[PDB]
Amino acid sequence: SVKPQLVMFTGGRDSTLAACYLMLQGIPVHLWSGNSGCSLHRGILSHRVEEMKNRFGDLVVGHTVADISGAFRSIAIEALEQDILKYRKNLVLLGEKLAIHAHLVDFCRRNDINTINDGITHYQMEFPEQRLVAKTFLMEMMAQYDINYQSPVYEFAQSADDVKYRLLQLGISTKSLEGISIFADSFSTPSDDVVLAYLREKAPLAHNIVNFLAGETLNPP
Amino acid sequence: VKPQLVMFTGGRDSTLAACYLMLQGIPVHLWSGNSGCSLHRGILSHRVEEMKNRFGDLVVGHTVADISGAFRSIAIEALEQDILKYRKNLVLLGEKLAIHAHLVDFCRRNDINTINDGITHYQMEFPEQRLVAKTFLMEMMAQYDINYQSPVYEFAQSADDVKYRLLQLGISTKSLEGISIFADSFSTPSDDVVLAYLREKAPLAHNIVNFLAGETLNPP
Amino acid sequence: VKPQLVMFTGGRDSTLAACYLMLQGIPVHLWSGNSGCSLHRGILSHRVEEMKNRFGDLVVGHTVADISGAFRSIAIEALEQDILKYRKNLVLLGEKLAIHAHLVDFCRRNDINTINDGITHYQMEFPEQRLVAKTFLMEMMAQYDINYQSPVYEFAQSADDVKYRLLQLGISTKSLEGISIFADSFSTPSDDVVLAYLREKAPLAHNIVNFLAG
Amino acid sequence: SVKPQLVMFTGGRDSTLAACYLMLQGIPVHLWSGNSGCSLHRGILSHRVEEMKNRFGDLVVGHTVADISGAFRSIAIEALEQDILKYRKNLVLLGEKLAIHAHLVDFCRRNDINTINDGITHYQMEFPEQRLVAKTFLMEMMAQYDINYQSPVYEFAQSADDVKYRLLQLGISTKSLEGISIFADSFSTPSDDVVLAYLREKAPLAHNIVNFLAGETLNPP
Amino acid sequence: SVKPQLVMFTGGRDSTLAACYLMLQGIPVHLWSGNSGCSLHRGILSHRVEEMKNRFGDLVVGHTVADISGAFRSIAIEALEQDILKYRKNLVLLGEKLAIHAHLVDFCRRNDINTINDGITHYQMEFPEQRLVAKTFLMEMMAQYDINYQSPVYEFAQSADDVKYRLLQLGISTKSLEGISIFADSFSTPSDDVVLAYLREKAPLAHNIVNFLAGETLNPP
Amino acid sequence: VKPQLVMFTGGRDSTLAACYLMLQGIPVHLWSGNSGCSLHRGILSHRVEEMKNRFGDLVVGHTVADISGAFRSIAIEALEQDILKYRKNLVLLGEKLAIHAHLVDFCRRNDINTINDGITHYQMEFPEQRLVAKTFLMEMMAQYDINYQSPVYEFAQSADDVKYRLLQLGISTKSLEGISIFADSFSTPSDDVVLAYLREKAPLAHNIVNFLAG
Amino acid sequence: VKPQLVMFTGGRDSTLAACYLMLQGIPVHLWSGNSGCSLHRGILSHRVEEMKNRFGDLVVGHTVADISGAFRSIAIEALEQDILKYRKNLVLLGEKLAIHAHLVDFCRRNDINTINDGITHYQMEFPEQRLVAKTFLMEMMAQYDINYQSPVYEFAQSADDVKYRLLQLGISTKSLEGISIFADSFSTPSDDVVLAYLREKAPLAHNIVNFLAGETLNPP
Numbered sequence A, D, E: 001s002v003k004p005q006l007v008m009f010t011g012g013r014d015s016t017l018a019a020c021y022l023m024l025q026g027i028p029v030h031l032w033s034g035n036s037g038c039s040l041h042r043g044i045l046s047h048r049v050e051e052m053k054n055r056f057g058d059l060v061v062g063h064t065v066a067d068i069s070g071a072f073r074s075i076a077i078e079a080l081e082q083d084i085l086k087y088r089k090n091l092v093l094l095g096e097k098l099a100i101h102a103h104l105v106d107f108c109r110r111n112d113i114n115t116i117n118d119g120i121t122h123y124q125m126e127f128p129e130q131r132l133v134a135k136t137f138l139m140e141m142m143a144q145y146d147i148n149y150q151s152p153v154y155e156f157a158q159s160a161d162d163v164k165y166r167l168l169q170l171g172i173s174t175k176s177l178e179g180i181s182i183f184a185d186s187f188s189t190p191s192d193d194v195v196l197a198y199l200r201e202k203a204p205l206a207h208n209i210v211n212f213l214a215g216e217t218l219n220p221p
Numbered sequence B, G: 001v002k003p004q005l006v007m008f009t010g011g012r013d014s015t016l017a018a019c020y021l022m023l024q025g026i027p028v029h030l031w032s033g034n035s036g037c038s039l040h041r042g043i044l045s046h047r048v049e050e051m052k053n054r055f056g057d058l059v060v061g062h063t064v065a066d067i068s069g070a071f072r073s074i075a076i077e078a079l080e081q082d083i084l085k086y087r088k089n090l091v092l093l094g095e096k097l098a099i100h101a102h103l104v105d106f107c108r109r110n111d112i113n114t115i116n117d118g119i120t121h122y123q124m125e126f127p128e129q130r131l132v133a134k135t136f137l138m139e140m141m142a143q144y145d146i147n148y149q150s151p152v153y154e155f156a157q158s159a160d161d162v163k164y165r166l167l168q169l170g171i172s173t174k175s176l177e178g179i180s181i182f183a184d185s186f187s188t189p190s191d192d193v194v195l196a197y198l199r200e201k202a203p204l205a206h207n208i209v210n211f212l213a214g215e216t217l218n219p220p
Numbered sequence C, F: 001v002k003p004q005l006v007m008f009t010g011g012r013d014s015t016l017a018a019c020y021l022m023l024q025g026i027p028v029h030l031w032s033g034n035s036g037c038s039l040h041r042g043i044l045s046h047r048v049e050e051m052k053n054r055f056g057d058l059v060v061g062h063t064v065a066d067i068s069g070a071f072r073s074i075a076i077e078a079l080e081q082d083i084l085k086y087r088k089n090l091v092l093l094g095e096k097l098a099i100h101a102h103l104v105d106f107c108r109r110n111d112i113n114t115i116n117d118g119i120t121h122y123q124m125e126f127p128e129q130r131l132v133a134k135t136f137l138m139e140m141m142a143q144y145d146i147n148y149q150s151p152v153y154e155f156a157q158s159a160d161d162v163k164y165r166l167l168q169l170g171i172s173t174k175s176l177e178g179i180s181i182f183a184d185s186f187s188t189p190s191d192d193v194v195l196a197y198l199r200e201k202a203p204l205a206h207n208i209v210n211f212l213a214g
């Protein structure tokens, strides 16, 4: 046995492979999925979890679906007017990732987990949060709470096709069985400077939410 | 109001085709061909559920047909000769021909005269979805007084077109279908090659039609 | 005695191989690879029943493994190139290599070091049953400290040899196995072609072995 | 509406196809299997019946498994010493076919069937019961009882491969799921003259069995 | 405490009495019945087993019904033409007895039994398997495997009447509740020389079957 | 066709008699007399099952009748006098007369006028199967307008004749009947003795017939 | 306190014998021989019920034994010769000998050394109940170290004696037993004939004892 680690798991190919690759090494994974409250057609996720339990047994130690709608709202939606007028870009989905990270601090500290993993693989332009500017920021944030952030399947596959057929060799389906954010395809591409500035602007809020969830303060930042 | 048949895989394109028919008041019989080389088909049932939920009685049925015999005869039996001649793996074109042979039999025995599929403009790179193939199969189906339509062909200029119409129906935008083991196992053929293959295998397909009708046991 | 694994399809030859091991006191794990292109495999369960009936606990289990991914990668993904180069459809040889890659993983994770199959002399036309293939796969399995035997190879000079030894065991003589959709879909290859194909796909097989092992 | 015909059905691919081809034409078939009491490992037959019911429904009107062991013994076994010393050939399986035909006269008369069909194929002419000379004899025999004997896969089947792949196209397994006679591979090849002489010697016994089964005589030939 | 012995049990009155007489002495019996695949109407056997369990309880340690059809075919059926042309006699039932004995070597070695018993009787010496010359041969055969072959009702049974009324005294039916070989009344009487020659010709096959069943060879004789 | 009754014991001969009637389209009522001195009659039900399996509704029913009282009165009550006079134990002939007395009653109350048994030529040693007995009982039954036939008498020159016609019907060749405790308890009588015994007990049988009819 | 066996038919005499033993604290195993010629035996169970009701645990069991084989061999097989020699039907004497042979076996295998029956003075006209028979059977049973007693013999000078003792026990006075088909089928024999028959059939009885013990299969 090894100490379980957490995987940020959406049901997509890439995070599926991340979890699978960990488990192939004997590393038990706690699958963690954030529900932001604006995600549609999330039913299929259960089919993917089933496939993974079938192939790896006990190594899937559990699947947590967390309601992060409150943190998401506070970080990304309450000041949507301000946010879009300032950055000229809809960064709601970036805010959601910050909300995920706040929740993960709480989850990790309450469940004795010190390693989290994500599904970064080959390069994907659509996801600003997979950029070094954002991942550096997020890694820093998690390290302030002594949480180790890994990307175990980084550049392990060259392309989406490489991810699909590695999963097929594992006896798992190639599809991305994830819910769809209502904000999918609802934004244009931001610069790295807008990404970093947004993360820095909302960070105080995220940290405050972390403190609230730990029972240390009610007061705003 | 008389049911029509939809060639249904669970993909977003065939889903939309069936849904759009049902929105017009047309009951659809969902028909899925199992060629025997299809992996991870379990998720299909989630899609069927979505459609029953949204349209009720207008989904008059779901038939899963074993077409592995016809598929093998058309597309696999002579695979060495086929690939050495055409220099391309056209197995999935063969599968569509096998589907159509079976559908003549199915339509004749179940009193259906209109079949529909999800072929789309944005997927014309796949041989079975090329105008040249569709035209050939329309003529084939008309020889048996069967009307073959493709109700999402002209509209779907991208997968996004299909996605957002599905979402408006309260249906997931994903393709909840099985994967052929022959996915990503082929390079793109010319139109000349697609037409030549269809013409070469047509005698076999028609022979399969005759066998399924109990009119011959003898070879093409 | 320590269990050994048998590559078991339900066919006469692999049935007899498993049975002959069990008659010697050797418990067998029956292992069946599903490549994703097999039809009418329901009858297999009738044969497993016959074997459980005749040998009891010596049948320690029956694993049906999904090997469709490895099979696809080795044998199907480059089928155009493969057929244009060798002028022969060697998909079923590919399947055998995919079986052996999966078996490395299976053996390491389940503490088995002896694998057995039903290859027979009388089926030498089929590439996976050629001496040159067998020799290659024995070398491959020995690189992972796995002993690969073929306990009915030398004896079975005809299907009749196998049939009547099965009958003596109170077992049906038929091959109660599934049918590959690639049955009767190929012409006969040379030994040189079988060896060259195995050597070309071996790097991929070893890569799949490493992936399955993390 | 369409009148059922009977198929002599063993579970082999040839008789399976014969029955299937009839049913494809709309002809309901009564599947008839003779158990001679020397047949081993007959359990798999029911798998084949299931496949056929699955593919054709109501057109399978029934499956009769008949005990023909008594007729078989009387015609083929009781005088085995004399039979083999005279003909120099083990013709028990020819005797079985005669016993089948005697039983079928009775069955057809009692069940209002006038057309019987079997799976004889060109590719299986080595076996005595599938030799033109035997078939011709049995056709004549059946016609004396106003029974039409047909062999609907005879001319088509130039090889087992022909039969297999027509079954596969029907969604049915290619295998011969039939029991095995203990007399399999227990004989060498007989001449036509010997097959005809044997049939003509045992014919009186067969006709006598027909009459007994109809309740017209108890007396021997 | 008392070590079980095996009885070759058909349901006939002679083997029934043999088993019963053993059990009356305190000797537990394993009833062993060989099914050669040519035996008809075997259902009544279970009525006889019931009678014996009723009368003797625990002393009936078991009833094994063994499939010996393969050994029987290989030794008696496969070369039936040659066998009958050479010996001028149908000795299939002698072959069956050899097949029984081969199977019993295997059964005795695997089940720790060293004494087998049958129901041979003086009054049934017409049949080859119950001829002194056959019994002597099979005794020798069994002794080569350190198996003691006994016939506990041989000297007593001067007629079927002797056996019947000793059964009746045990509260057991007098009938032979056994299946019937299709080869019943299918043979004329052989000489001793012919019985010995046949046994000696098929012996190599029997010993080979013994070795196969022990997992020591696949090769033919 | 109108049902007929068969005197059925489960033995070969009566089994074949009933079967041969049914093959002709004649429904049979199977009738078995229990004399009170029969052992191990459980196996009879196996034979009835075989016959129902092979002929269905043509078996219209199976009556097991207690005839112990008539049997006792005819054959047992005066056994000392009977044996001292005839020098032979004729109890089983008595049983047959008791069967026939009961059958008069049964036939009148159940609308049957044809009775049949399994008597055979090959069993002429047994008094109830002698021509002289059969003739007497046919006369007796005709006094009550009952037709008494023996449909396997002339044909069965040996038990083998019966056996192999049964086998042809898919029925076991064995006699699945009970055993009289009087089996093997008697020496062979003359025809004169059989006739004289029947004639002496006939008044008693007719009296029992009248009693059963009120 | 060690069980003894009672030869029990359901009749008033054997009922009283068993009851009187149980009144003294002696547990009884009720043993009933079925010779295969016995009619209307169903009422026996009513009598057993009465006795269980009145005595509880002291009724340790009820064995019904099939003795038809021994009965047939001793009494029926040679019925012609037996009646021609003795001029009397002694089948029911034979039955009692068969009962006693079976009881040697039963006693040896079930660790019982005392058997008891209901023979009575008032029924001395029946051969099995005659002093001369009882004496012979006592000697026979003593050769196997079995004690044979008849605990109601001397007291029962009439059926009325038995009746009224039963009634005092809360038990019905009737004989709730089966009837032999050989009831009223015999005239009364002399003592000489009873003794001679017993002596002639004794070798057969002892042979049956040996067979039941697994010591011989051979004839007397």
Ligand SMILES: Nc1nc2c(ncn2[C@@H]2O[C@H](COP(=O)(O)OP(=O)(O)OP(=O)(O)O)[C@@H](O)[C@H]2O)c(=O)[nH]1
Pocket: A160, A174, A175, A176, B092, B123, B126, B127, B128, B175, B182, B183, B184, B185
């Ligand atoms: N011939 C043919 N091949 C198809 C068809 N649909 C899918 N495929 C094959 O199977 C593969 C499946 O990949 P996609 O359908 O793109 O998978 P997806 O998850 O829906 O979408 P992506 O996220 O873009 O991979 C294709 O790349 C083709 O090789 C079709 O209609 N015809």
Ligand SMILES: Nc1nc2c(ncn2[C@@H]2O[C@H](COP(=O)(O)OP(=O)(O)OP(=O)(O)O)[C@@H](O)[C@H]2O)c(=O)[nH]1
Pocket: C092, C093, C123, C126, C127, C128, C129, C175, C179, C183, C184, C185, D174, D175, D176
């Ligand atoms: N590569 C390969 N092909 C095989 C093998 N066994 C069968 N095949 C192919 O499958 C075809 C049919 O196989 P089956 O359906 O089992 O038929 P069969 O081998 O002739 O045997 P039966 O079914 O007993 O008549 C063969 O003619 C070959 O083309 C095998 O071990 N390897």
Ligand SMILES: Nc1nc2c(ncn2[C@@H]2O[C@H](COP(=O)(O)OP(=O)(O)OP(=O)(O)O)[C@@H](O)[C@H]2O)c(=O)[nH]1
Pocket: E174, E175, E176, F092, F093, F123, F126, F127, F128, F129, F175, F179, F183, F184, F185
């Ligand atoms: N009167 C009379 N006695 C019979 C009859 N059948 C049998 N028995 C007597 O019963 C004895 C044994 O009968 P079964 O036990 O049937 O024996 P079996 O007749 O020799 O026949 P199997 O049991 O087949 O060997 C005979 O030897 C006769 O003494 C019958 O029909 N009438």
Ligand SMILES: Nc1nc2c(ncn2[C@@H]2O[C@H](COP(=O)(O)OP(=O)(O)OP(=O)(O)O)[C@@H](O)[C@H]2O)c(=O)[nH]1
Pocket: G092, G123, G126, G127, G128, G175, G182, G183, G184, G185
């Ligand atoms: N040998 C013998 N015969 C007996 C015995 N008990 C009864 N029987 C016979 O069976 C007949 C039965 O008649 P009972 O016992 O008198 O009948 P019951 O109804 O108890 O008394 P009753 O009202 O007097 O008739 C006797 O007449 C004897 O013939 C017995 O102990 N020994």
